[model samples]
Target chain A: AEFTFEIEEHLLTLSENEKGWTKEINRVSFNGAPAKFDIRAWSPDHTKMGKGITLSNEEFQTMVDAF
Target chain B: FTFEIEEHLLTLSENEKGWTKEINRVSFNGAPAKFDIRAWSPDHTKMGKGITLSNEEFQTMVDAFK
Candidate 1:
């Protein structure tokens, strides 16, 4: 894959879908960049993944305040 | 830091403690819209942690149905 991400920390597991992919949050470093908060679906083996969102610490703080 | 909920997909569950978990199509910070899964206050003035998925990812999950 041209763009790749490495999971740094598995923060939370919200749910697991029928296919056994887990929807969860993790700290991930994409393309060797600094890690950020990431929420998405992952296969059990962590080999495949679903497109998801990433949030910087600053952005996360703002989101928390907005909410 | 701006966002707008374009559509409400479905309510996954509700927490009597205060919020409702759901999926919605959301456009965030001027980016293209994506399907977002998160918890929110009834009025949507506040929100909880959530995840957003691209159209393709959402479709792939839906395809999991037998």
Candidate 2:
């Protein structure tokens, strides 16, 4: 059985920062699912983490609707 | 020593992915919380995030892990 997850969709899309770098934002877990996601950009050394959000997959859309 | 679960680790044993989740505690709140767990990875590389979850949320996570 394939127990791994696939990228069902990109909620935040791979984004770039003003510093000229890119990052990841996640949402759903393929079809085999649960949970929500957040995208973040790493520093050049990746020693520092970026700030992001976490919402239940259920509450995610409700929060997004505010956008 | 002030035992702090400010550290939550979610990792996969070589054989399984999500099945190997370990939480020192789920890291959250504008600051951190009281629950302690010891758990990583989509190559998950972060010490924590600024998320806020209720004790109810923590219970949901613990239940599924049970």
Candidate 3:
């Protein structure tokens, strides 16, 4: 099952690889699904991606407070 | 910690201590909710570690088992 995604918002960039792919947080919705906070590495043009984690609004807050 | 469960997707199992492992779309502290898989106390007062997945990741995992 393949799916597509749309970036609802570009939250922040945590880092950038040597190739310019960025590890970042963004509000992304997949195939018309509800948007959620995602931390993933993406191509410069946003056409490619790498593995990362995701969080809901509440979960993000809980994680930050845990630190 | 406050939680609002917008949707309860599944109840995977329950242990003797009344801890239920399940999937749900829940928001904590008044934030937006997302698909979550974790174990929760029967009273819903606390939770165990779990993963929150993007819709895309959820689908990818689903496809992997097919």
Q: For every model in order, what is the iRMS?
A: 11.4, 13.1, 12.6
Predicted candidate 2 versus true structure: per-residue lDDT over B5-65, tens digit per residue: 4554333122255322333444444445633222233344533334333455444433432
Q: How many steric overlaps does candidate 3 have?
A: 0
lDDT of 1 at A41: 76
Candidate 2 lDDT, tens digit per residue, A1-67? 5544343445443445687544544553534666356434445544454544434544334333422
Sort the predicted structures by TM-score, highest score first.
Answer: 1, 3, 2
| Off by more than 4 A, model 3 | B1-66
Per-residue accuracy of model 1 over B1-66 as CA lDDT, tens digit each: 899998986665677876876678999999988888787898987878777777765655454321
| Model 2: docking quality category | incorrect
lDDT at residue B54 of model 3 (Cα atoms): 51
User: Where does the lowest 10-residue lDDT sum fall in candidate 1 chain B?
Assistant: B57-66
Order of all candidates by DockQ, from best down to worst? 2, 1, 3
Best-matching candidate per DockQ: 2
**What is candidate 3's lDDT per residue for B3-62, written digit by digit as tens?**
777898776667899998677888868877866767789987788876555565555444
Higher DockQ: candidate 1 or 3? 1
Q: Candidate 3, clashing residue pairs? A: none
**TM-score of predicted structure 3, chain A:** 0.87
Which ranges in model 2 have alpha carbons more than 4 Å from their true place?
A: A1-9, A18-20, A28-35, A43-49, B1-48, B51-66
